[model samples]
Target: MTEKFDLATVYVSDAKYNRNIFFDTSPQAVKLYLLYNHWFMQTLVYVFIIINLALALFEDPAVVPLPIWATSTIETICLSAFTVRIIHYAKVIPKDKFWKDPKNICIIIIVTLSFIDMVIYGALKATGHYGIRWSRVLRPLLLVNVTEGRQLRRAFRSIRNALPQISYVFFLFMFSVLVFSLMALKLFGKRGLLTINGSPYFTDYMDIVFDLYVLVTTANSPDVMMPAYNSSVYFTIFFILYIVINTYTFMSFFLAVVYNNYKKYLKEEVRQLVKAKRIKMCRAFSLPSRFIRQMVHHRVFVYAYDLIILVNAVFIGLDEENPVVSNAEWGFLALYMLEILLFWNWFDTIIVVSALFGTIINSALKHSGGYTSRQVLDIVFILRVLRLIRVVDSIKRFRAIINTLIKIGPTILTFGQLILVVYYIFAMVGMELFKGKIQFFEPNSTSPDREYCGNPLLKSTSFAKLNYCKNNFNDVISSFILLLELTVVNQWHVLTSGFTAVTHVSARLFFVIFHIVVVIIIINIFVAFILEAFLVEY
Candidate 1:
């Protein structure tokens, strides 16, 4: 049968005349394909994030003995893959044109650095220096994948571009808080965990000014500083200031910027569509009646974009209204309560645990070579719930915790070692001092001899009392000593089971100080470093 063809065309490329149809094909073809294949890239992003989260939770050297070698290895492989893909994509435009394209320049730099990392990792593995392999994966290259696509990229770029303006606003407000906190520290109680060196002795005008200046500056890194020894009042004041400034300026600015960009992009897309004749002129020119009416009447959707910002702003303002209790002090109360409530709720716990689980499953799917119905089901059931888990896991990664850890590292380690030695000494002293005492009292007591037999020195009335005293003292000392260890270890329950059993002030204090230090260090170093690596765009 003959097929009749009738064609009406203004201008079109002839199929026979077409030269090359394949796009983004190169030496790193698989990697490049993965980069632009939005789904795969997104899956990879979540997978890496989840890996980091899991490391934060389970594999942290501070937490367990399950050698974090996997963390480092996986990080290297993933980063190398990412860098290879970036190089492959940039090569699409050809080597001769690379210098002229800013994006291409970024890709080249990323690839070069990534290659150097790969080589270093190889050398390390070959030379038995595997410790630094994790360092290769430590940068923020993952963020590029997180913010993929033109729209998201543009939004982030806009925010980054507006850094100067944002910084000015941040400085203006934070400066006010600095002055207030310093004044409070100077005028009021300034001992014990409040002030550094147990004194608020900034007699020099420049020193006083500089200290406040430093506090304000560092505070912007998103890590909260502990009030030096006796500076609770100062810290409280500064925290209040942080809440206000962050709520009014930082939060609001980003929200505004993102929303503005969203609208701008939408408008730009619509305009481009009309210009390109992709849509009927009438349909394009009408601005869509739904959009027009919504815009004109100020619909609820208009405020949807600002919901998080508005709620946070209002909460901060309300919470900050009370001056007797600094908002910073109250912040912990809320966080702890929330954490407790969430932990107990099975539904919430599932959500929390699932984030890492989800990421793992998703990554497995990618690595599996292809997706099947079973994989999709696993993803749907696991990944969504697990997102909450990732969030809780990442909370520790924030700047405040990380920076505190960095600053307190020496003290934490020194005190931690001293604590262990002190415990051992006390244990021996108590054993010697009360050994005979408990044996004498055990037979006289109504309680079963079997229970007392293990420590027979407790039978003597005088000796029993001494033994009891010794045991209680030992317990107290051991508890106190446990507080000095790193949080990741404590949280993982390696140091002491009671470390994370946060039922009372003793337990809470133990975890709090350790966690504070950890949070600060991770935020200031790990998070910042990783994010910078990710944002190093090409």
Candidate 2:
């Protein structure tokens, strides 16, 4: 009676409630599915059967139609099965709950992506472009299928957990491509693969030809004909097959989807916090305040680093010019220091310490706890020092560094404004004291000089060739005044405009106080709030 009830519940419950739609349908079928789910196993089996059929008919292995034929055939069969399963699940489940059901949603995404793979492959085959390389698109889809089969959950979880590390891998790859490639080119010059002396490896022009090709076809890298170095042909072909297939194309889009979902997951936590009244989300700020705060926070530093890295890499590759390192190099180094700081900010020292601890514990367990207390003490000390090397973590751990920064974030704008006000007052006095002492521009005494200023529209019409009437002093002073005006006004605007006002500063004063309050508010919004929010939420 209990067995009958169990069977009945498995069949009668809504498919939304049934966790194993794919595997629990039958016992033998589940085993069969798992057995053939290994990489290329099912596809190979289909290929072997097709080859046998061809050999029986034509008595030649040459007419086997290649592995792509088998891949496409297997995909078609699975696609039909997946589609039917989706329909069956959807029919029994309530419409409103279908989207809420994780299994259903995953299955839908899998089947949809699978269909796309089928269509892309079908198009390629029809156009006579199909090959074993074309079938690799179907490989990533295997992960999707395993998601449905329930056999792939552990692997997917591992992949999901490792997603954050994927960015580091990309950082490594990009660093290698830009830095090492440039080194190779610089060292090798015309003797190496980089053809155009100082051209970027991944510019718009190169992107279209190489990245686009790999993206559309989904071909594997390390293509058959690897070309020799210093030829534009080599890098172009390599990038087309390599970057596009691996990074720019469908692979990138897929990764983006995964990342965006990850972000949404991060944001959801924020939303939950807001829902739980742990934090409040608010926004009301002016443009200038936003600008000033973002400036202080070093937001453009990323773009700057990207530009410098690319430019330096290009210059390095084109060693013919013998480019000397410029101020930009220093700026890039400063930005890199900031990048390292940012990395340390998110990844705590404890995580690293914990990882080492886990390794040590595992090793000790394997050796039947043979390690001495002194050995353990040495291990812990080493791990502790290594973890302490994370600058941000040390700051956070001590409470001194982190607290000082947090305290300073609110007061920073007040100090900034005071400096600006002093500078402004000095500028006004300087203009009054020695207005004509400095040359803002060369007084156009002759025709060529007049043309130089007047033709370029550098001077106002009222001031053009006006001669030494002491009026030019006003112009010079006005230019200096204007420079001071832009400097002060821009900073002032950003502070007065945003969300940081309440927490960072009090709305106590009207002139100095209003601007101060605004500045404090904006800084809090960009620096403190954004940092705190992301840390808590993600």
Candidate 3:
């Protein structure tokens, strides 16, 4: 068996990636190779992973109590499938590469560990030792992906290379923390001599650093600051000063894109820092935009946290009947609260704070106030109305769009006049031709004894009548309203069909011509003109 690394063809593309890797092909290895390379097997392996992890969670006696039979059978099937796939991998990949690939190494360890767990579980089952299966704790590490592992391997090397360069920046963070630690001790440590672990002591030096460090991390909103801040607002600035330095300036890491650009233009000393990707004031940082961009792209764990939160919520949803599952609702709230504290955006913070408040308020509310979620829903609707106010307040583009419309008032009026003239022309035609032709029941139809009114020569039946069957075009305003609806393309075909049934089928041409004159050409032209002017203004 052998594998080939091909570099022969410069593929027809912009970048010309010539490198190609081909796995082994041989008679004995064919079956294994099929399993190894197939997306079907890959998908099955992933299902196996989910089953194994979920099985472990279920087997854990504390939270879930799925039957041992279900857990054992599912895990065994997964283990067998995982083993065969790994064997297939070893058969197909070159020996050195197979052994050397970090992801492959992890896969081997994962399968081996799983196998060992199965063997131990078997032994325990036979002996009636339904003991704690600790291996399940390691089960979640199956989260690794080959693509990400290679990328992560690159990231790992970058961290090693860059850490040496950022040693000074690390020291800068260290020094800042130290400076705040001493200041916190001197400023607020002695105010209240509380001996609580969560509370600060006036004379204690040990906790001030830890507390100040916690403050710098923004993990807590100054529990230490509270004792002093309750007394005065002056020391609040002390905490604020540290956060501005620690959270924004010192901790705001350099982006690789920025660093790569910097490397093209600069000294090696600074180049090392930039490439390591932690620059305090990288010139590319126009606003917090760079920092926000870095967090959004590089801090991908925000997405991972969302995934975890979603899963946790789903778990609770899957079994709210269980006390354990019910309790996880609060556990997850705590986790979300922790995340809220860490992120500390006003919007996110408001959410968790309101969640806690709403839950407690709801608890006391049902028995006391004559209420349910109805009041909450009403308030939620009102809050939505309140939230829309920000459209005119904080959003400049929204402001600009409104302002631009006013600025281009004359031009838009020209389009409106142009549109109105087309409408008048079409309106008159429709009024004369189709007005009162397709008729509705008279207002007396509400009496239930009334019959339809129209030319007896008209068709005896109408489809989508009443609201959809508005055949009234007896006047200018009424005709214009119908014409405007057609201009807006509000199911213009319904009216068109109504007209067709009453008049000759040739009358469909009227609607067609109107659509071409207004909807297709004029309306779009009018919109594009305004958009173009607004774009230039902005």
Candidate 4:
């Protein structure tokens, strides 16, 4: 007959199992214990946050709720337990070393904040009052620390590593702002355009700094810089340079840092996978002959061997699959064959055709004595070399990215045409309004007036005096470029200042409206299109 089980005996057995798991001094046991404690603390913190939110949302004072004492006591116990864990960790590791890490320091700060929160809670409850609602603000910080602390720490480390590149971009931006502020002050100081009713544009260094910040952030309101633009035609150049450098160049650099770090992390993960496999393979190699034979004949090994053979057959024609080939071999062969037939064939055709044409052309030229120079032959060779870039299409990821771009190309082209049409309309309006009056020199004059253009500061610069509209916006092509620059909110001050110098102050309306349309509407639409395409494809 089976003996009846006792609850006390089961409890003892369970306790023994836990004691062995937790109390062992081995590295694996220690790691498991630490991981358990971390997850336990994380769960407790999450539960605490949820409870706080619930109480805030649903608690009623009319219903005499369980007294605050119960909640306070529970919080005190949790805090004490967390403190014990922290102290234990510090003792196990060195106190100085434990505190040296930024993540550890963040934990200490959060704990201190929690203790302060508890103290405030207790004091308020003792006085028969509710705590301030804003005090719950720290609750979200705790949630964040518990939920995503490791990922946040890793991101912080990546930013720290990229600090030098970021700092350089910042420095360049500040330097441009400073230089342009001074120029704005010099050019527009006395003109009514520098200020509206005694309020000065670029009134102080800080104002100019704020304007630059606004421009860089793409909050491009024409009102902010209207006065400066009205004062000098050349002022447009400043805004253009600022936008190009900060928005495109600096912003791209920041994205590059993030992407590079992401790629680095992915590569590390791959390396670790390969490293683990290598260790297993090495262990297998060290085993006896029977084990080695078993490993060689394993399903994974055979599959891998077949895959390599298939790749060779497709790219290097090392082998051909037939009835003799295994199912695994045929599977890989079918996959590679499809890839070569669909994608690689087009590239192969292009290469072969280009090579044939080049050989024929070279032979004809040599026989006819029509071209003695090798330079023409070199062109044919160069064309073939360029076609060789199609080899990159063989890479699955690269091909996928290209296919995505091509799919989105039609929409992008349509949007681009719309932008061009808008720019053309604006350019025609600009040319009509300030055509002759905006000329840098006086009527029929070839040289710039010494008063405006002769200053040593303007000498040997793009801003140097010229006779024409000087902005290169007179013709369709140049106008398109200038309008494009305006859309980007670049040195638009140059265009506006030139118009103000020639026409009525009402000319500001045209530019201000143009800026609103192109920058706020058209550019954002293009950006949205690109982002949507990337998200959908990726």
Candidate 5:
């Protein structure tokens, strides 16, 4: 059991995948034949298999709520039924090689596991020696050979294919973490710079290394930094840089490669090998229309049409009172009517009709207000620009950036989930710690960290520099608002100083830890990863 090799080989090698039905030989064999040939025999076995698994689940009655030391009698009957099927059909195998066949092997292990479970369940009846009856562990191995497990089996095979690539990434990750932890040990070494007459969990090289890991795994930072901070001011720089390194760079590097390879593997596994070859045929009953349709698809002439559309858009932007610009619209409309006739479809008709309707209305209406009818219909003028944008796909470089925007979608979802968690916890803690903590206070260098507003307005709301911090965590919504400004770094230190007037050194930890995790680590790393993908695209 401690040995390593492929387990699935034993489940399938030299085994009969389709065992022969046994009833062709004798009276009892014939009874088995009739039993199996009946329409619902497989259904009955399927139902029994389900009930057998459910029987195992009913073990602890109190939790899900039920009985005492629950019996496996129904399971015993189910296993007996499985054993009968396995025994008779296993006549397909020779006696010497019965153990070699996996179909028989899978059923045998399942039967023995349940039997062992039942033996112990009753065997320990006198309060005798016992082991945990975890026989149901191998129960799912049944479905691997039976039902819709083929797809699940393919998933297993794909994972095995992905394992080697993933293990190296794991190796790289372990090495990087340990290397930094060791560096942290020597650089931030010795127990001399620590709290005295107190228990020190942050001692020893290895003990200090655990804090680095704890810092890595959670928003929790190394409180050991305080000791290091007193040791030297520059020592805190290591945490700032390493916070960015481990959180954003290392995690992104590891996950990007791991999922990238796994994605390729899954893609290969499920990708369709063949598609029906469709031969689409087209006909031209009329003569001139075919010439125009071919011209629309023509290598040289397609740009001529696109050029006019683009220049026509430029004409719309220029002052409409200009005579050339006015004729440019009529000229394009005369050209556009024929083109719509040529390719008379949805996109062609929509923008042209909108422009056509607006133009006729412009001619029909007189002055109504200070804003003329033409400028009011200027909103409708944008339809030509929309049509121009559709034609810009002719540029190969433009399409690459367009595709990049599409690819950014999944990255946004992942980082948003992460950023959302950081915001959620910060907002929760911010509310608990700092709710109604923002009040009017005097900003005197002489009287540091002192709260001073006029007596009646000792905390009464009005307008002042200190008063603007009303996005305090007094409620859920503003708590999020306060946390958002903190993450955004729009002069967040001012917000922090306001909190200091009402709170103590306590406020420092919240802002410092949040800035390192959110601003320096997560959001920074997220930008770099996007840049990484974007750089590769060009």
Candidate 6:
């Protein structure tokens, strides 16, 4: 009943087979090769690579009392086996095609480097130079190649796509640095006070460039500004303009570039998910079928729901009081309806709770007969803007960003805790060192030599210009604020200038150390952490 085809006709080869097979040409050998190529075996090899990297990094035999020779022996054996496997696969496939895959190339390079590192390490150990451990650095590179190649590839793609905007931001930073450096040299060069006998600040052209870089990053501006302002009004104006452009305009533009790139990458990910048909799988677990269908099929439903909420909120705002039902009653009704319809969506619930709390406070203050009640009521109505979140959630791209932020919430909190600890320690040190030593400047006071109190660099600089705090760092709260400001490298001159006046040259060294630790090191650590999380995960 069935027709059969000839095996010779069905199985045709276009190219001649190579006779130089690496593995044994038997059933047992073929089974062993296939077993090693299985996903489980590949995963085991990845785990082994990770364990070897960990042992190299943390399990130093000299310090941790672990068997360093044993780890090295095992790692060497694994590397040999892996190399053999690679060669076997290389012979099995066409030479050109096998060499073309970037993954294969990366694996070969990592293996080669790792082997060289081991050889050099053994040589160093044999020569009684065991103190040297260049292999520790080399091993992580190999591990990264093996474990994070895919993530690195994606990150490179993202960077390549965003190169134009990134380049523009870099150009702006360098151009600003150049202009500021030239102006700083012209203004502060040859000035005896800035270049005083042993002053460690502002000695040359490169020093000016470095100082400008510090300014561009908004670190320790106040210290620079205070001394520069004492030199000339032109210098003060220049510093103020530089801060405005650097902090507000350039920083904001940089943020825009980062956000735009993030959005572009997220869109690309969404497209890939759609192409791979994984979006439906993700959606299936996240929401009810009816709600998902409404979001995807009936887009107009979302617009209408948002519109109704906005309209109702506007009407309630216009009519603060009602004859049939009070504003408080209307708020309660809306909260109830949202809870029933949305099944307790957290964002909407939070907004409703805040609104309700504001309404209760306003009602309680009604008999006070001041504008306070009306002000509270106005703020409560402002919660209406939160309705826009519904619209944001309807968009797939925005939703993805929100989901990513939620997923990384714990990392952000950990980073925030580290920052807080740094702030606290520095704040205590600042209070101890500068307490009762620093005072605000009074314009009409007898101490005319003292620097003026008000910060001309900020808006509303006129307020409290007439008074002086006996000790600016007297209170913990004020000290914390000062230290926090220093973390951002803003208005740091307040502490440095005041301390330097009393403590003389030592204050400069202290502040230089502080800026090095907090601004340069700590801030960069935070940035690196965020970038790693984003690029690796998202």
Q: Write the per-residue lDDT of candidate 1 for residues 1-538, one digit (tens) a residue.
A: 0111101111111211211112223435333433444467656754654453334222222224354455456655655666655555554335565456455455446546644654564544457442332422323333333323232333334435545554555465456655655664554333322333444454434444433433333322232234332444544565566555644455455344434443444455446544544332222233287667546424453243234324433444444336543333234234323444212244444543443343444466558654564765455444333323333323345334444445443334333332333333333332222222222234466556534422443333332332322222123233233333332232222221221221222333333333333332222223333343345423
TM-score of 2: 0.24
Error of 4 at 286 (Å): 13
- Taking all chains together, each candidate's TM-score versus the true structure is 0.33, 0.24, 0.40, 0.38, 0.39, 0.44
Instruction: Report the error of model 1 at residue 181, Å.
Output: 4.9
lDDT of 4 by residue, 56-79 (tens): 222112112455566555555655
Candidate maximizing TM-score: 6
Clashing pairs in 5: 61-66
Model 5 CA deviation exceeding 4 Å by range: 1-57, 60-69, 78-104, 125-131, 140-147, 195-201, 205-210, 219-233, 271-538
Q: Whole-model lDDT for model 6 versus the true structure?
A: 0.55
- What TM-score would candidate 3 get against the native? 0.40
Residue 312 miss distance in model 6 (angstroms)? 39
Q: How many residue pairs clash in each candidate?
A: 57, 17, 4, 12, 1, 3
Ten residues in sequence with the least summed lDDT for candidate 2: 278-287
Better lDDT candidate (3, 6): 6
User: For residues 1-538, what per-residue lDDT tens digits would candidate 3 score against the true structure?
Assistant: 0222111111111131111123234544544544454668766776776676556335533135567667777777877877677667667655766767666777768767766776676654367453435455445445343321222233234334544445545566667878777876777657645343553454565456545554543445555566666767886788778888775676443222223322332243334544433222221232177677457534665555556555664563376348776556566557667664341244455655555544654475556665565676455334323323332322234444456647444445444445554665565456656655644555566533223434433344333333444445655555666787777765565566567667786776787677645654455455455545545564
lDDT of 5: 0.55
- Please report, in order, the local distance difference test score of every candidate based on alpha carbons: 0.38, 0.39, 0.53, 0.50, 0.55, 0.55
lDDT of 3: 0.53
Q: lDDT of model 3 at residue 295?
A: 71
What shift in Å separates residue 22 of candidate 3 from its native position after superposition?
Answer: 5.2
Q: Residue 137 of candidate 5: its Cα lDDT?
A: 46
TM-score of 6: 0.44
Q: Rank the candidates by lDDT, best first.
A: 5, 6, 3, 4, 2, 1
- Per-residue lDDT, model 2, residue 201, is 30
